[PDB]
Amino acid sequence: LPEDPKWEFPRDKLTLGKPLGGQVVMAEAVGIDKDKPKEAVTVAVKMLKDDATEKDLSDLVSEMEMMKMIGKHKNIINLLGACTQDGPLYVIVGYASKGNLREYLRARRPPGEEQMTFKDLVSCTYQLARGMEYLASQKCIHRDLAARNVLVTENNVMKIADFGLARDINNIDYYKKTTNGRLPVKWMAPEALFDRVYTHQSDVWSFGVLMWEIFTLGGSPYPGIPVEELFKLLKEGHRMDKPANCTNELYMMMRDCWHAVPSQRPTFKQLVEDLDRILTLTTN
Amino acid sequence: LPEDPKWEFPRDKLTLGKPLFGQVVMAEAVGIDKDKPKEAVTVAVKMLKDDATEKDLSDLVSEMEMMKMIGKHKNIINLLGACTQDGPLYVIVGYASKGNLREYLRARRPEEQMTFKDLVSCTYQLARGMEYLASQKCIHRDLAARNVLVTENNVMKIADFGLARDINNIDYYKKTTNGRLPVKWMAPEALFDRVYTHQSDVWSFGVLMWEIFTLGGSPYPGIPVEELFKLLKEGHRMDKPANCTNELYMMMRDCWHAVPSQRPTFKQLVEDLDRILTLTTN
Ligand SMILES: Nc1ncnc2c1ncn2[C@@H]1O[C@H](COP(=O)(O)OP(=O)(O)CP(=O)(O)O)[C@@H](O)[C@H]1O
Ligand SMILES: Nc1ncnc2c1ncn2[C@@H]1O[C@H](COP(=O)(O)OP(=O)(O)CP(=O)(O)O)[C@@H](O)[C@H]1O
Ligand SMILES: [Mg+2]
Numbered sequence: 001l002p003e004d005p006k007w008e009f010p011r012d013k014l015t016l017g018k019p020l021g022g023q024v025v026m027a028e029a030v031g032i033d034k035d036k037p038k039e040a041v042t043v044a045v046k047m048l049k050d051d052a053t054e055k056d057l058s059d060l061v062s063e064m065e066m067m068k069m070i071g072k073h074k075n076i077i078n079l080l081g082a083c084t085q086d087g088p089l090y091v092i093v094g095y096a097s098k099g100n101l102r103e104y105l106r107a108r109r110p111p112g113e114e115q116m117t118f119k120d121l122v123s124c125t126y127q128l129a130r131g132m133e134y135l136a137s138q139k140c141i142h143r144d145l146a147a148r149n150v151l152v153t154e155n156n157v158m159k160i161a162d163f164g165l166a167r168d169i170n171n172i173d174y175y176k177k178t179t180n181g182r183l184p185v186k187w188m189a190p191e192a193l194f195d196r197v198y199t200h201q202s203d204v205w206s207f208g209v210l211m212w213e214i215f216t217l218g219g220s221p222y223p224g225i226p227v228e229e230l231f232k233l234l235k236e237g238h239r240m241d242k243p244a245n246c247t248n249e250l251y252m253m254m255r256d257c258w259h260a261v262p263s264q265r266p267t268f269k270q271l272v273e274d275l276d277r278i279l280t281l282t283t284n
Numbered sequence: 285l286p287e288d289p290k291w292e293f294p295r296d297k298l299t300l301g302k303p304l305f306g307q308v309v310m311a312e313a314v315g316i317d318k319d320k321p322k323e324a325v326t327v328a329v330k331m332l333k334d335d336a337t338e339k340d341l342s343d344l345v346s347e348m349e350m351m352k353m354i355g356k357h358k359n360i361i362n363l364l365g366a367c368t369q370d371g372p373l374y375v376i377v378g379y380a381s382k383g384n385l386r387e388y389l390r391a392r393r394p395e396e397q398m399t400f401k402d403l404v405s406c407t408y409q410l411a412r413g414m415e416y417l418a419s420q421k422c423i424h425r426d427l428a429a430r431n432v433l434v435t436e437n438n439v440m441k442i443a444d445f446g447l448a449r450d451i452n453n454i455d456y457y458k459k460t461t462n463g464r465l466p467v468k469w470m471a472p473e474a475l476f477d478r479v480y481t482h483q484s485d486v487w488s489f490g491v492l493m494w495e496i497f498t499l500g501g502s503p504y505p506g507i508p509v510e511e512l513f514k515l516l517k518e519g520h521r522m523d524k525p526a527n528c529t530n531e532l533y534m535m536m537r538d539c540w541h542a543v544p545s546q547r548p549t550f551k552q553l554v555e556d557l558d559r560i561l562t563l564t565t566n
């Protein structure tokens with residue numbers, strides 16, 4: 001693959017460590033932060049598994065390239081560098097000490113670890129909306145939004161991650177039977193499968209399920225409902241029930257994200273504004 | 285999903301158990317053996333994960349359909365039934381108490397040690413299964429120790445038909461063909477030419493042989509997937525395993541012949557392995 005100095009990082013400056021969670025591992029990167037040339041830094045490294053397929057490699061490359069183009073943002077996991085020459089491809093990204101959001105929330109469920117306050121949940125949701133709002137402004141569709149794909153930092157900052165299925169808005173083959181076949185069904189917008197398209201509004205549908213996972217503290221969507229029976233139920237108007245401790249207002253937000261008609265759903269900008277209000281009013 | 289009465293099995297007679305294109309769990313099936321209507325049989329059931337994708341569903345469906353087509357053979361995991369109506373798809377297959385071959389072998393490393401004859405016997409059984417598979421015009425495409433199951437009586441059983449296809453159902457020369465086959469068990473032509481024939485499967489059999497004789501070793505140790513095909517193109521081949529005779533290693537090299545038609549057929553492999561096994565036994 002093409003050499004790209006600006007992002008290349010020395011293999012001898014990286015010490016691979018313990019497994020995290022193809023295959024992702026923790027590691028120390030000496031001087032990865034150019035202003036601290038000798039300072040070792042704890043990072044995360046994504047690389048291929050030993051039994052990886054060709055598609056796994058093209059996916060890893062795609063993920064790296066997408067992260068390069070997206071740019072930097074508070075709520076998006078950051079690319080730190082990559083080892084792409086004379087050796088196995090290593091994609092180095094910022095290390096999130098708290099793990100993924102799904103595991104994070106479940107570990108903080110009431111004893112029935114520090115519990116999540118209603119404000120923490122709204123704040124978590126608001127941060128992600130901002131992240132998605134930015135992504136959309138960069139013409140990027142994630143396509144795989146879910147609690148298991150969000151990382152939490154030491155200071156509880158939410159980071160959208162796993163861009164292994166992400167695409168530039170124009171890099172989607174509309175109407176082909178093979179388009180969107182690798183998207184987890186339970187987080188997927190109906191038009192993704194039915195019409196074989198994908199827009200930012202398809203991402204808002206996913207965001208809706210993410211909201212539900214957040215307010216159920218890491219629950220599994222459509223419990224008891226098999227994936228092969230889901231789209232039938234969705235066509236019939238079925239939608240997940242309101243999470244226990246969730247305001248009717250936040251629930252209507254989820255419901256709005258699940259409008260059958262894409263343009264009928266809120267834009268991420270609208271979600272940010274609404275959530276900003278709710279968060280603020282909760283604070284006061 | 286079209287109803288196929290012949291294979292349909294009642295859901296109320298199936299009790300899912302502990303965990304083992306999906307996820308496999310142990311289960312108890314009452315009357316799966318039609319001659320013993322009230323008997324509970326321990327089986328294995330493959331189903332979709334909660335986060336399954338559309339492709340995960342079509343693969344499981346394809347897996348089921350491929351197993352129905354293939355027919356029965358002692359060295360191929362057998363289909364017992366399937367719950368396809370009004371509910372999640374369940375593919376019910378025979379339970380293999382010893383797990384997959386790779387785990388089985390790594391456990392028997394110098395937990396009852398494997399003898400040279402056992403290893404050959406193991407290899408011979410798999411060749412027999414592949415010979416039958418090839419005769420049914422089926423290409424497995426994902427042959428490897430991790431895809432071989434071992435029954436209570438140490439019978440080898442080729443499994444995981446999640447990538448298998450009929451020999452004529454291949455999108456020839458398309459750049460997207462064979463994109464989901466583990467690279468280290470994959471025949472060179474499968475990637476360079478985008479084709480897949482029974483001879484591609486024999487190449488994988490070779491790797492499988494190497495895993496067997498190294499007692500579950502990982503192929504091309506120390507070589508990343510990204511670097512393997514250039515090496516393979518240059519002639520690189522894995523070295524002989526210690527607990528392996530030059531003859532058996534030569535069989536591996538034959539399976540890895542660069543030219544597809546120059547690799548032996550499964551029919552020829554079975555004949556040679558039988559001869560070798562017969563000698564090792566007598
Ligand atoms: N930067 C990071 N810091 C901390 N943990 C990380 C991390 N990147 C990944 N992980 C951990 O590894 C898990 C899997 O990561 P990721 O979502 O990137 O998976 P993956 O693309 O390798 C496979 P899949 O698509 O099956 O998830 C995360 O849910 C998280 O627990
Ligand atoms: N019939 C059976 N009896 C016993 N164990 C079984 C079994 N079927 C599957 N298993 C166990 O589950 C493992 C995975 O099986 P299988 O190879 O079918 O996986 P899979 O198709 O679900 C996913 P992948 O393609 O990622 O392996 C096997 O290696 C074995 O340990
Ligand atoms: Mg992920």
Ligand SMILES: [Mg+2]
Nearest residue numbers: 162163164165
């Ligand atoms: Mg991924």
Ligand SMILES: [Mg+2]
Nearest residue numbers: 430431443444
């Ligand atoms: Mg398998």
Ligand SMILES: [Mg+2]
Nearest residue numbers: 305444446447
């Ligand atoms: Mg499989």
